[PDB]
């Protein structure tokens, strides 16, 4: 009877689909009046004008209507005075919020009922100017040595240094009121000098360090949740309408009145409302973000700068000493990369024996300090959580910290400041300079490619910071009936023959910065070298990080050491990231997705009846001051170590042209680029950097080189002072080593159990061979233990998983989100509430959260008129086709019971939604106007090699392969520079075809579904092991509990994936320009029997031809399902948590039918969809390809 | 609860399911289209080819 | 078709280890278990008549 | 413990060796398509208690 | 294709040989050995060679 | 210095004299699967050394 | 006393001259001076 109940749930999941686009559609009718008007799509007639301010539109098919959206004409506005306008309003201090910026009328209006139920709010205190600020200011100059500091040179901007006389931190600025010092005489070396430290202080700062860019109107959001009856909103509101705390946003750009950072006090507070109700904190968990969200009101990111040493101090020793047994993993098969988590039994009693070391004193200070600041109970919660048992609400009070410190979003130091302050042993260079060199050489046997000189110019095409680029002008024009006669301008919109018809024109002039359109625009650059490149300045970049982390600043290298790096240094990072099946643990690659199977090794020891195991885990910061002088240079010797093995070179660097350089050339130079120091601007200031650099893909094999040169001494230090002093030696078991971060698993080499006198020794590192502060760090900074690890913000804790916390969507970098189509967004929203459910959310709670932010979404406007579509998107094809109640299976949208009607014209209008002619128009018309743009040197080496007839075998031709063919190549070669440019002007042209072709009836006709299959399920047995995600949603734990979890080594590949890597590992076999992608198209679009004639048509030498032909034959199911979605937004965590390979098929899946191997699999991830949707609930199903009884009468098997 | 009857009927009253349809109909559509005018002489049509496979 | 070869991890050779002395305990156990139950039936029971 | 390897590797033999069509259907189709390692450690009990 | 190859190709490879030859004396010829096995030959690199 | 022959029309050849099928698994294949011309210098260098 | 580099540097000339993970990552120098205490002995 489980097809029974599984038909129910459809049905279920059917109702719900209905309610939530009803409420959806009700929550609307608020925001904008009752719809006026039901226009129907194709057989109603109306002429764009007199349709009313709000309508909607429907659609007819077989004699029922669906619901297609709604339509606003922002002409007839006066409708919207029903409901706001200024009349309303008559409370003084409203007034002024409505002149500072209309937008916040609506809400101006609801909080005067507010104002009207009697209840009045009292104003609050703003903190004043603190004078010391005035000492903190240093003007550099070349008088006082740049203030004797070797980084800076030739700067031109002020720095906020730590001064006896001025205040702590800084950089970090202040919430102040405006009314502070317009002009303040400065004292430097002449004394004349005067800053206007107002004008700076409100103008750069509140931009570039506390920038603010809600995913929607921020004024729509507030009026949907700031409900004023909140505590909390009536406490932020006794800070924003009290006192007269104003802020607005214009643009992109946010405008204060009378306080800094007053938009900082909407993050936190719509924050604080948020994360409440994501996490469904318990009563105490309430309280203690009561006191938090008190004591932070009154600087919003300052306090949390203040707690940031004492809350990390405190989390680092959570659940240190738990009595609880927890979770058991077996240790079996823990030194290979096949490792995998597995149940065994453990006797009860191993807590006493278990140990971690807790640096009590530290404790006791960060307590006192908590106190200090008057943050009593989350101090009390903390040192609580420290010695108790492992429970979920437990382990959300232990986190409640990091939720805590989350408050702020994104806050960065000031930038000249962050510049200068992350700007500025003869056996640690020989194991650094020997890891390197044996780094080199693995990747130089491995991908040898690089050396040959005919090679050089494919690896650069397929592999910035250039000086020099091109730039495109031009006027985009496109004729719009969409506009009105008084918007019509001499500048932009002219009125045409047409009636009702208008031209718009966009002037846009804009330089190909991306790095593609620069490399086939201007090769050159990246080619030549001249030695006097590795002194030429190039431009940096900031980011931002959610939380108060330290800001990080990206320092490209210039093209032509990009090239070199790319023939050189590429092949040691491509070797790194490789790690396969059947390698050991202490391997190069094993050495250095998905939580659990990551951390396994260490989930395994913290769970486990044997002690002798322990986990040590070091995180090393603020070594690039250590990264500069010798061990730059022991790298640069590493790196020219490999010059012996080839032959031409030359003593001294040389300028070089890289397709005829000899490889000991370019391994000089890289060598050179890697120990010079290199100079980088931005801001005005200009720094020198002689350690790591922070070079892209360059990073990584640096610091985990080092790394695994400090672990070898330290072990081999620790094993001669436990010969010295009579104690059990260690054995290093297994290790992971990503950036700065490292955890590894040592194994006492006698079984002794480990000892507090075996931790201190070990901790202590270099004793009596450096000063006593590096053995203090090094204490604070590393823990070891058998209870609890930590690494890369993935916590573990006896057998068990935590993740982090600082993940949201309501306040992005850039702003991106803003720029994006609505499919775009609406799988942005999609993507993070998933990620949100493997982690302290619930389906409940990410569900609620998810449609709310759908409720708010800005919607489609062109013109003066607005788009908004129905909610039941989500299910149609195209986007993730979700389940309501089980959202983590997309494209399961397609088994709900919709009504076949409905379903076809949902696809439609999902289909129309998104449109690819406005970009063709677009580069077809930069093309006319400016020409060709690639280089010649790409003409001529993109001919055809295979000496075979372009016509083929007179077969049909498609589009496609005469675009990708090499005959017709150079104009396919400009569209891609032509693709590289994104403006306005495209999205707004998307955006008016969408509203034209909605509403003149004409709906793109959806493209078929590649698998569909209807599944009979009967009952079965369990397979899978409890999830270590404890705080996981029950769902995915019992998700977990019958089928499996998933490892690295049995995870799926995408197509595209392996076509690219074939491509790659054999540079020569195809022109450089063919991407998996366009292959992949070219050959879902012709029949299978002629896919050969095709590759010699792209001209795919053998070696490449028959991998992608396999491949092709193999994995074309993926490719087809999803290929009318993109995918660049989707990073399914929840989803790729479970076991869905080869290894739970034949347990779940039953097909008898003789099928060919792609359409086999696709037809198996189908009924893998009703599996896990039947698994999400606890039980363990097998489907089958044919009903059980089909007659009442008759009955079958197999 | 007729429309259930019906599919479940489908599925005896043929000896295919569908995915041996779709297999099937992978094989057929698109050949006889991209193939020359000379090979086009001598191949059955797509139409043909549907009815000699169902 | 797919048999893989055996690898001996030390965990595995202990993991044996611990086993065997497990055995032992448990075949000393039940001995003891089997004698003293001999032990009671003599002196409990005596022969069954129709 | 065991090794781990991929049944690409012995699947293509049995491939070259037989005639596979993607098309056609034949008998080495069948002793493929229901080629499952997920039981083998039950067997591989099994064995050693034969 | 590979003794087409071979036959076609030898000319040149013979001349490579005997520049290089020139180079080594004739100790050198009949002292040095391959002993450390750095240089040897996957059995891909032998059939695409050729 | 080596001349860039591109070996389309070897490998044509070998796929007639061998009948290669894209929709079934020959030996041809396999030969003709992993041609890796990426080592070629390195096993030009060892043919001159022997 | 005991020097990792040399270690180090044997591991990567053998590993050059002929994989070899299978006993290089095995290798530790924990236990020389009891081992060497021995050789005297014996």
């Given at each position: 009877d489980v097809q029974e109940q599984f038909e129910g749930y459809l049905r279920e999941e059917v109702d719900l689909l209905n309610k939530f686009e009803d409420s959806h559609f009700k929550q609307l009718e608020i925001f904008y009046t009752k719809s006026q008007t039901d226009h129907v799509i194709n057989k109603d007639k109306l002429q764009f004008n007199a349709l009313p301010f709000h309508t909607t539109l429907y659609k007819e098919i077989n004699g029922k209507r669906v619901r297609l959206g709604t339509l606003l004409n922002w002409t007839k506005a006066e409708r919207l005075d029903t409901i706001r306008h200024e009349s309303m309003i008559k409370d003084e201090r409203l007034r002024r919020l409505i002149d500072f910026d209309y937008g916040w009328i609506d809400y101006a209006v609801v909080l005067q009922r507010y104002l009207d139920e009697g209840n009045t709010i009292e104003s609050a205190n703003i903190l004043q100017f603190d004078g010391d600020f005035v000492n903190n200011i240093k003007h550099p100059t070349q008088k006082n040595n740049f203030l004797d500091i070797k980084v800076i040179k030739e700067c031109e901007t002020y720095i906020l240094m730590k001064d006896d006389n001025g205040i702590r931190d800084?950089?970090?600025?202040?919430?102040?009121?405006?009314?502070?010092?317009?002009?303040?005489?400065?004292?430097?070396?002449?004394?004349?000098?005067?800053?206007?430290?107002?004008?700076?202080?409100?103008?750069?700062?509140?931009?570039?360090?506390?920038?603010?860019?809600?995913?929607?109107?921020?004024?729509?959001?507030?009026?949907?949740?700031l409900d004023p009856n909140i505590p909390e909103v009536r406490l932020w509101l006794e800070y924003f309408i009290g006192s007269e705390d104003f802020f607005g946003f214009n643009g992109p750009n946010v405008i204060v009145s009378k306080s800094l950072l007053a938009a900082k006090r909407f993050e936190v507070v719509v924050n604080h409302l948020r994360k409440v109700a994501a996490f469904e904190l318990d009563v105490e968990s309430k309280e203690v973000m009561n006191e938090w969200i008190k004591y932070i009101m009154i600087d919003p990111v300052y306090r949390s700068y203040k707690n940031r040493g004492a809350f990390g101090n405190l989390n680092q020793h959570v659940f240190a000493r738990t009595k609880s047994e927890?979770?058991?993993?077996?240790?079996?098969?823990?030194?290979?990369?096949?490792?995998?988590?597995?149940?065994?039994?453990?006797?009860?009693?191993?807590?006493?024996?278990?140990?971690?070391?807790?640096?009590?004193?530290?404790?006791?200070?960060?307590?006192?300090?908590?106190?200090?600041?008057?943050?009593?109970?989350?101090?009390?919660?903390?040192?609580?959580?420290?010695?108790?048992?492992?429970?979920?609400?437990?382990?959300?009070?232990?986190?409640?910290?990091?939720?805590?410190?989350?408050?702020?979003?994104?806050?960065?130091?000031?930038?000249?400041?962050?510049?200068?302050?992350?700007?500025?042993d003869p056996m640690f260079v020989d194991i650094v300079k020997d890891n390197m060199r044996v780094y080199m050489q693995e990747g130089l046997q491995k991908y040898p490619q690089g050396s040959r000189k005919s090679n050089r110019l494919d690896i650069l095409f397929k592999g910035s910071s250039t000086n020099e680029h091109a730039v495109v002008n031009g006027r985009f024009r496109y004729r719009s009936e969409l506009y009105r006669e008084r918007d019509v301008n001499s500048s932009t919109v002219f009125k045409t023959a047409t009636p009702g018809q208008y031209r718009v024109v966009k002037k846009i002039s804009a330089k190909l910065k991306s790095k593609n359109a620069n490399i086939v625009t201007h090769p050159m650059n990246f080619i030549n070298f001249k030695v006097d490149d590795l002194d030429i300045v190039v431009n940096a970049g900031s980011r931002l990080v959610r939380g108060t982390r330290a800001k990080r600043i990206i320092t490209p290298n210039y093209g032509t050491i990009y090239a070199a790096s790319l023939m050189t240094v590429l092949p040691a990072v491509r070797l790194l990231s490789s790690r396969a099946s059947n390698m050991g643990a202490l391997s190069t690659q094993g050495r250095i997705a998905l939580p659990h199977d990551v951390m396994a090794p260490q989930l395994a020891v913290t769970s486990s009846d044997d002690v002798s195991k322990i986990c040590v885990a070091k995180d090393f910061g603020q070594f690039d001051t250590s990264q500069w002088?010798?061990?730059?240079?022991?790298?640069?010797?590493?790196?020219?170590?490999?010059?012996?093995?080839?032959?031409?070179?030359?003593?001294?660097?040389?300028?070089?042209?890289?397709?005829?350089?000899?490889?000991?050339?370019l391994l000089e130079v890289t060598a050179m680029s890697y120990e010079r120091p290199l100079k980088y601007k931005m801001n005005g200031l200009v720094c020198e950097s002689a350690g790591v650099k922070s070079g892209e893909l360059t990073t990584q094999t640096?610091?985990?080189?080092?790394?695994?040169?400090?672990?070898?001494?330290?072990?081999?230090?620790?094993?001669?002072?436990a010969y010295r002093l009579n104690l059990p030696k260690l054995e290093l078991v297994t290790d992971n080593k990503v950036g700065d971060d490292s955890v590894e698993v040592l194994r006492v080499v006698d079984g002794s159990p480990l000892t507090p006198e075996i931790a201190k020794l070990y901790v202590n590192c270099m004793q009596d061979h450096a000063d006593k502060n590096h053995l203090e760090i090094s204490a604070k900074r590393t823990i070891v233990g058998n209870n609890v690890a930590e690494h890369i913000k993935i916590w573990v804790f006896k057998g068990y998983l935590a993740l982090d916390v600082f993940l949201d969507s309501v306040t992005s970098e850039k702003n991106s989100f803003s720029n994006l189509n609505y499919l775009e967004q609406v799988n942005i929203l999609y993507d993070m509430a998933m990620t949100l459910m493997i982690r302290y959310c619930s389906v409940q709670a990410c569900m609620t959260q998810?449609?709310?932010?759908?409720?708010?979404?800005?919607?489609?406007?062109?013109?003066?008129?607005?788009?908004?579509?129905?909610?039941?998107?989500?299910?149609?094809?195209?986007?993730?086709?979700?389940?309501?109640?089980?959202?983590?299976?997309?494209?399961?949208?397609?088994?709900?019971?919709?009504?076949?009607?409905?379903?076809?014209?949902?696809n439609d209008l999902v289909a129309s939604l998104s449109t690819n002619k406005p970009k063709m128009d677009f580069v077809a018309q930069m093309f006319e106007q400016n020409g060709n743009q690639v280089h010649g040197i790409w003409l001529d080496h993109f001919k055809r090699k295979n000496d075979v007839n372009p016509d083929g075998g007179g077969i049909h031709i498609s589009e496609g392969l005469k675009r990708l063919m090499p005959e017709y190549c150079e104009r396919h070669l400009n569209e891609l520079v032509y693709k590289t440019l994104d403006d306005k002007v495209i999205r707004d042209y998307t955006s008016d075809i969408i509203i034209t072709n909605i509403c003149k009836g004409k709906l793109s006709k959806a493209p078929k579904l590649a698998f569909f299959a209807n599944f009979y399920l009967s009952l079965t047995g369990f397979n899978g092991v409890d999830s270590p995600y404890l705080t996981a949603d029950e769902g995915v734990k019992n998700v977990?509990?019958?089928?499996?979890?998933?490892?690295?080594?049995?995870?799926?590949?995408?197509?595209?994936?392996?076509?690219?890597?074939?491509?790659?590992?054999?540079?020569?076999?195809?022109?450089?320009?063919?991407?998996?992608?366009?292959?992949?198209?070219?050959?879902?679009?012709?029949?299978?029997?002629?896919?050969?004639?095709?590759?010699?048509?792209?001209?795919?030498?053998?070696?490449?031809?028959?991998a992608?032909?396999?491949?092709?034959?193999?994995?074309?199911?993926?490719?087809?399902?999803?290929?009318?979605?993109?995918?660049?937004?989707?990073?399914?965590?929840?989803?790729?948590?479970?076991?869905?390979?080869?290894?739970?098929?034949?347990?779940?899946?039953?097909?008898?039918?003789?099928?060919?191997?792609?359409?086999?699999?696709?037809?198996?991830?189908?009924?893998?969809?009703?599996?896990?949707?039947?698994?999400?609930?606890?039980?363990?199903?097998?489907?089958?390809?044919?009903?059980?009884?089909?007659?009442?009468?008759?009955?079958?098997?197999? | 609860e007729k429309q259930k009857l019906d599919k479940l009927k489908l599925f005896e009253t043929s000896p295919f399911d569908p995915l041996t349809i779709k297999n099937n109909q992978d094989v057929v559509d698109k050949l006889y289209a991209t193939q020359s005018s000379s090979i086009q002489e001598v191949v059955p049509t797509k139409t043909f080819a549907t009815e000699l496979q169902f | 078709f797919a048999l893989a070869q055996i690898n001996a991890d030390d965990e595995f050779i202990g993991a044996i280890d611990k086993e065997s002395a497990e055995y032992l305990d448990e075949y000393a156990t039940l001995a003891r278990d089997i004698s003293n139950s001999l032990t009671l039936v003599k002196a409990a029971f005596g022969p069954l008549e129709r | 413990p065991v090794d781990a390897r991929t049944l690409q590797s012995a699947?293509?033999?049995?491939?070259?060796?037989?005639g596979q069509a993607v098309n056609r259907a034949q008998h080495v189709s069948m002793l493929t398509n229901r080629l499952t390692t997920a039981n083998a450690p039950t067997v591989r009990a099994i064995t050693v208690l034969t | 294709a590979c003794r087409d190859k071979t036959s076609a190709n030898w000319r040149g490879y013979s001349v490579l040989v005997s520049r290089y030859r020139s180079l080594i004396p004739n100790e050198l010829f009949e002292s040095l050995r391959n002993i450390s096995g750095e240089y040897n030959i996957n059995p891909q690199d032998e059939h695409s060679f050729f």
């Open positions: 800084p950089d970090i600025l202040r919430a102040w009121e405006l009314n502070s010092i317009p002009e303040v005489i400065e004292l430097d070396v002449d004394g004349e000098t005067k800053k206007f430290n107002l004008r700076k202080e409100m103008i750069k700062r509140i931009q570039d360090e506390a920038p603010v860019y809600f995913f929607c109107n921020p004024y729509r959001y507030a009026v949907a949740n927890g979770l058991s993993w077996s240790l079996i098969d823990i030194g290979t990369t096949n490792f995998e988590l597995k149940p065994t039994k453990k006797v009860a009693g191993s807590y006493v024996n278990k140990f971690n070391l807790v640096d009590d004193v530290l404790v006791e200070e960060s307590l006192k300090d908590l106190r200090n600041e008057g943050l009593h109970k989350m101090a009390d919660v903390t040192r609580r959580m420290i010695d108790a048992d492992i429970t979920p609400e437990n382990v959300k009070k232990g986190k409640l910290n990091r939720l805590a410190l989350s408050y702020c979003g994104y806050t960065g130091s000031h930038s000249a400041t962050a510049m200068v302050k992350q700007f500025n002088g010798q061990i730059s240079k022991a790298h640069a010797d590493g790196v020219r170590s490999m010059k012996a093995h080839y032959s031409m070179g030359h003593d001294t660097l040389v300028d070089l042209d890289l397709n005829d350089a000899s490889f000991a050339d640096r610091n985990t080189t080092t790394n695994i040169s400090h672990s070898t001494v330290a072990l081999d230090d620790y094993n001669n002072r998810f449609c709310n932010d759908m409720k708010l979404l800005n919607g489609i406007r062109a013109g003066n008129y607005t788009f908004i579509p129905t909610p039941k998107i989500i299910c149609a094809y195209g986007t993730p086709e979700i389940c309501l109640r089980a959202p983590e299976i997309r494209s399961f949208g397609r088994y709900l019971p919709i009504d076949e009607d409905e379903y076809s014209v949902l977990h509990r019958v089928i499996g979890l998933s490892y690295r080594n049995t995870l799926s590949t995408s197509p595209t994936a392996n076509v690219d890597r074939i491509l790659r590992n054999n540079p020569g076999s195809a022109p450089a320009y063919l991407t998996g992608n366009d292959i992949l198209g070219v050959l879902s679009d012709y029949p299978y029997q002629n896919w050969r004639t095709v590759v010699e048509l792209l001209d795919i030498t053998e070696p490449s031809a028959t992608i032909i396999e491949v092709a034959t193999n994995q074309m199911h993926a490719y087809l399902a999803d290929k009318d979605l993109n995918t660049a937004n989707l990073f399914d965590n929840t989803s790729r948590t479970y076991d869905i390979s080869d290894r739970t098929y034949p347990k779940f899946v039953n097909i008898t039918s003789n099928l060919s191997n792609s359409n086999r699999r696709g037809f198996q991830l189908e009924a893998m969809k009703h599996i896990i949707y039947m698994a999400r609930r606890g039980i363990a199903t097998l489907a089958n390809t044919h009903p059980s009884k089909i007659g009442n009468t008759v009955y079958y098997d197999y | - | - | 699947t293509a033999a049995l491939a070259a060796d037989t | -």
